[PDB]
Design a protein around this ligand. Structure first.
Ligand SMILES: [Zn+2]
Length: 257
């Protein structure tokens, strides 16, 4: 029912999902001057060498690249986190135009897209239990700007023709998510929420400062996807981003000076 249109978009979500107006909603604007450097924060540990990608799915709101999360194969630890978080999927948010698409903003700057690598806290046993907990998820967010191509993204781009419409999936084995990371792991962190319904307040957000560059041709392929199912009126999958929400009683911390 929910989506990104005039009639079912982010300004309507609160009617079915009242937590939409809650105290720890995401995304937010990152005001770089008021974020506090926190010397007690640790380097992030991204351990993706044994990652096992399985499948790519058009779910009607984005496409998800799904992983085997039945063992500790691709995990996030350190940084602001206690314990071990397993990678379950990644997906993107993007615009109809290069001047919009990201969910987080930086001093009100919107990027062309934003990658979310979604991980759940192994102490809760599965994703569905983790989303019911205030420290259940850790989401690594990475900005995309348009410039040079990202070679590690092209295998994703090239499979999108096979999953044009809602409900389509394709085999997507042997994909290495290390090829989507920038050089630096410097980050901001704050407590927040899922950015799609059910909007649960279960996320430790870790947003990298350094964007990756992708080509205009790469992002143009994202914008050829469809929100609709096969045989239905074509609606391009663009502008699948929630705008910045009120920060309320939260502090954004920086890992770097
Ligand atoms: Zn997302």
């Amino acid at each position: 029912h929910w989506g990104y249109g005039k009639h079912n978009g982010p300004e309507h979500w609160h009617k079915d999902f009242p937590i939409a107006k809650g105290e720890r909603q995401s995304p937010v604007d990152i005001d770089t001057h008021t974020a506090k450097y926190d010397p007690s924060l640790k380097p992030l540990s991204v351990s993706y060498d044994q990652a096992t990608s399985l499948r790519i799915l058009n779910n009607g709101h984005a496409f998800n690249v799904e992983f085997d999360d039945s063992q500790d194969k691709a995990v996030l630890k350190g940084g602001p986190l206690d314990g071990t978080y397993r990678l379950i999927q990644f997906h993107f948010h993007w615009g109809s135009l290069d001047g919009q698409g990201s969910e987080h903003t930086v001093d009100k700057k919107k990027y062309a897209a934003e990658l979310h690598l979604v991980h759940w806290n192994t102490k809760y046993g599965d994703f569905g239990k983790a989303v019911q907990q205030p420290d259940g998820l850790a989401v690594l967010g990475i900005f995309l700007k348009v410039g040079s191509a990202k070679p590690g993204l092209q295998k994703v781009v090239d499979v999108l023709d096979s999953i044009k419409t809602k409900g389509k999936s394709a085999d997507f084995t042997n994909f290495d998510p290390r090829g989507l990371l920038p050089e630096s792991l410097d980050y901001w962190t704050y407590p927040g929420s899922l950015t799609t319904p059910p909007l649960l307040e279960c996320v430790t957000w870790i947003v990298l400062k350094e964007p990756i560059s992708v080509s205009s041709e790469q992002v143009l392929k994202f914008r050829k996807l469809n929100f609709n199912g096969e045989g239905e009126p074509e609606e391009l999958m663009v502008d699948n981003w929630r705008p910045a929400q009120p920060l309320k009683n939260r502090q954004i911390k920086a890992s770097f000076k």
